[PDB]
RNA sequence: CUGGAAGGUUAAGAGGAGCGCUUAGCGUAAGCGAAGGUGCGAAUUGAAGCCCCAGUAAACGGCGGCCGCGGU
């Protein structure tokens, strides 16, 4: 989000759309079912890299 | 078009298992019936080709829809 960009584990409940967006379906196609091998930061920039 | 393995299909010719007609004989008749002649004739065998398989587009040819780069 332009103003509220963040990454964290959340307890909050979220309402999902009745139809999943294209990006969501793409992520599902490629990485749903997969395992997170590593999470790393690109130097000390605000960029997290998930190896899946 | 070129090449080709299995499997399938296919001519004449080859081959005659059988069958019909005829009748010496045999039978009171009805009918049976050798041999010969004669008229058909099944299995089996039978190439290329074709089906089939592979390649080949400066061979003949052909080079999409629909929906939201993705889906179908």
From Swiss-Prot:
Record-annotated disulphide pairs: none
Induction: Up-regulated under secretion stress conditions, possibly in a CssR/CssS-dependent manner.
Free-text disruption phenotype from the record: Not essential in rich media; synthetic growth defects are seen in double rqcH-ssrA mutants, further exacerbated by translational inhibitors spectinomycin and erythromycin or at elevated temperatures. Decreased accumulation of a stalled reporter protein. Double rqcH-rqcP deletion strains grow normally in rich media. Triple rqcH-clpP-ssrA mutants cannot be generated. No change in sensitivity to erythromycin; double mutSB-rqcH and triple mutSB-rqcH-ssrA deletion strains are hypersensitive to erythromycin. Loss of Ala tailing.
Entry comment, domain topic: Has 4 domains; N-terminal NFACT-N, central helix-hairpin-helix (HhH), 2 coiled coil domains with a beta-hairpin in the middle (CC-M), and C-terminal NFACT-R. The NFACT-N domain contacts 23S rRNA, the A/P-site tRNA anticodon and recognizes tRNA(Ala), while the M beta hairpin binds protein uL11 near the base of the bL12 stalk.
Role summary: Key component of the ribosome quality control system (RQC), a ribosome-associated complex that mediates the extraction of incompletely synthesized nascent chains from stalled ribosomes and their subsequent degradation. RqcH recruits Ala-charged tRNA, and with RqcP directs the elongation of stalled nascent chains on 50S ribosomal subunits, leading to non-templated C-terminal alanine extensions (Ala tail). The Ala tail promotes nascent chain degradation. RqcH, RqcP and charged tRNA(Ala) are necessary and sufficient to add an Ala tail to a model stalled nascent peptide; does not add Val.
Additional note from the record: Activity of this protein is best tested in a clpP or ssrA deletion mutant; ssrA (tmRNA) encodes the SsrA tag added to nascent proteins in stalled ribosomes by trans-translation, which targets the nascent protein for degradation.
Family stated for the protein in its record: Belongs to the NEMF family.
Subunit-level organization: Associates with isolated or stalled 50S ribosomal subunits. Binds to RqcP. Interacts with ribosomal protein uL11. Displaced from the 50S subunit by thiostrepton. In crystallized 50S subunits RqcH is variously associated with A/P-site tRNA, P-site tRNA and RqcP, an E-site tRNA or A- and P-site tRNAs and RqcP2(YlmH).
Protein name: Rqc2 homolog RqcH
Species, as recorded: Bacillus subtilis (strain 168)
Gene label: rqcH
Residues of the full protein shown: 53 to 104 of 570
């Amino acid at each position: 989000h332009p103003s509220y960009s963040r990454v964290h584990i959340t307890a909050q409940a979220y309402e999902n759309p009745s139809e999943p967006p294209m990006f969501c379906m793409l992520l599902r196609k490629h990485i749903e079912g997969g395992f997170i091998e590593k999470i790393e930061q690109a130097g000390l920039d605000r960029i997290m890299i998930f190896h899946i």
